[PDB]
Amino acid sequence: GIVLFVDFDYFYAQVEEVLNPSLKGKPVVVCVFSGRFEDSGAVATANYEARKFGVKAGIPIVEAKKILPNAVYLPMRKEVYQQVSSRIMNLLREYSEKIEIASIDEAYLDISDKVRDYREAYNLGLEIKNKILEKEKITVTVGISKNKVFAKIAADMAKPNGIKVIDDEEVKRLIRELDIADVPGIGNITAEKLKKLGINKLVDTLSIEFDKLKGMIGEAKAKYLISLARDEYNEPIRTRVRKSIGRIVTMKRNSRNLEEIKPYLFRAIEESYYKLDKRIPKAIHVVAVTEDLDIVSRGRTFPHGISKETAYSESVKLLQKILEEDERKIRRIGVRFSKFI
DNA sequence: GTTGGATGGTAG
DNA sequence: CTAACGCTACCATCCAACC
Ligand SMILES: Nc1nc2c(ncn2[C@H]2C[C@H](O)[C@@H](COP(=O)(O)OP(=O)(O)OP(=O)(O)O)O2)c(=O)[nH]1
Ligand SMILES: [Ca+2]
Ligand SMILES: [Ca+2]
Ligand SMILES: [Ca+2]
């Protein structure tokens, strides 16, 4: 069938531009301030103006402020971005009811029965692009191909404010030419390990004997690269169900003291149980980011769903568990709920 | 020798 | 305080329980 992929352009940043258009065309940086000191924290994202000077997601707000001291630094308003996202995802639903909301900013439509060929798909893509640009002022990039992965790849090639169709014949061309690093699911750690095996594109995966591919990346990514490269890979647009909900916050200073940390842990619990919204988790994990940025987690699965009261007292037992079992001072603390009924 | 649970890594 | 927030899917690993 034919998959159409939407990825909203510089999302949090753009939304801020829609809310304050006197920002458009000059560098905008959306940050998560951590409160540890003046301008501590990270950059959630940045518009392309900012992005031209290396201000991207994940870098400290202070590294960015040295590069672009005069840029606009805006604190992250996820509540707001989520509202816009929700509305756009709802727009998308009126184009195909076979939707998979993949993330806050991306979604896959299976348009197979709304269009006859890729050319009709492209026009639909333009229809969708305008409709969003008209109803939400957000530019997005559309990637259309035979399936999820490739449609995502097309979007990655056209962004920002782009549209790429990757026809059955174009698919084949990329397998041989696309950098494996650009394959969805292939990050730096996997890229590195694949380059260690002479694997640069997809192609060289069909070259390498399966046996030593899983013997570097595990069974899953191995199957994944191959089905992609053999032009099989069908994965259907399945309606997303949220499997875990969590919240994790940053402390004013690293601490090992149970009492200093609790208020942070509870803040997260409260936030999490709120985001849960009618969902009853049977599992809770307290997650701690150490001083050296290792992420550790202690958790517990219950025979039956967890009440907020249970969450509270178990989280503490779990934080105790982390504190006794891990030497390091904790920097960030939070909780995550899974296994909903 | 699967399925579930706890914990950690990877990636987007 | 001294730079590194936030989220969630899926997978890997280990091991204990177990049909
Ligand atoms: N707090 C935080 N938010 C992030 C981070 N990475 C991404 N996000 C949020 C902000 C982004 O606007 C949003 C969508 O992620 P994308 O990967 O699609 O990047 P973005 O849309 O900003 O650029 P776009 O034109 O596709 O490239 O997700 C991160 O490291 N931290
Ligand atoms: Ca995206
Ligand atoms: Ca995006
Ligand atoms: Ca990559």
**What are the tokens at A16?**
């801020």
Sign of CA dihedral A219, A221, A222, A223: positive
A6 in the same domain as A104 = yes
The answer to whether residue A106 is catalytic is yes
| Beta carbon of A8 within 6 Å of any ligand 1 atom | yes
Q: What is the CATH number of the domain that holds A178?
A: 1.10.150.20
Q: Was A168 annotated as part of a binding site?
A: no
Same-domain status, A181 and A319: no
Q: Is A62 in the same domain as A96?
A: no
In a domain, A206, yes or no: yes
In a domain, A132, yes or no: yes
- Two structure tokens written together for A209: 């004997």
Number of helices (H), then strands (E), in chain A: 12, 12
The DSSP bridge partners found for residue A287 are: A297, A334
E strand spans, A65-123? 72-75, 99-101, 106-110
Q: Which of A183, A210, A233 is the last residue of a domain?
A: A233
Q: Is residue A93 part of a domain?
A: yes
Which nucleotide in the DNA or RNA is closest to residue A218, CA to C1'?
A: C12
The CATH number for A151's domain is: 3.30.70.270
What's at A253, amino acid-wise?
R
**What is the enclosing helix (H) or strand (E) of A266?**
helix A258-276
Q: Of A194, A204, A203, A200, whose CA–CA distance to A176 is shortest?
A: A203
> What resolution in Å is listed for this PDB structure?
2.8
Query: Are A161 and A179 found together in one domain?
Result: no
Q: Is the CB of A308 under 7 A from strand C?
A: no
- What is each CA distance from A138 to A160, A183, A198, in whole angstroms? 11, 26, 40
Do A253 and A306 lie in one domain? The reply is yes
Host domain of residue A29: 11-77
Same domain? For A143 and A131 the reply is yes
Closest ligand 1 atom to residue A57 Cα is 30
Q: Is the CB of A332 under 7 A from strand C?
A: yes
CA distance A84 to A78: 10
Number of domains composing chain A: 4
Are A121 and A134 members of one domain? yes
Asked if A275 and A318 sit in the same domain, the reply is yes
Asked if the structure places residue A100 within a domain, the reply is: yes
* Method underlying the structure: X-ray
CATH of the domain at A304: 3.30.1490.100
Alpha-carbon dihedral of residues A138, A149, A100, A46, nearest 10 degrees? -30
Same domain flag for A193 and A137: no
CATH no. for residue A29? 3.40.1170.60
Domain assignment present for residue A239? The answer is no
Q: Which of A6, A11, A159, A249 to mutate to test the pocket of ligand 1 (most atoms within 8 A of CB)?
A: A11
In a domain, residue A238? The reply is: no
A317 touches strand C (CB under 7 A): no
Compute φ and ψ for A340, nearest 5 degrees: -75, 145
Q: Which of A25, A55, A77 is the last residue of a domain?
A: A77
In a domain, A341, yes or no: no
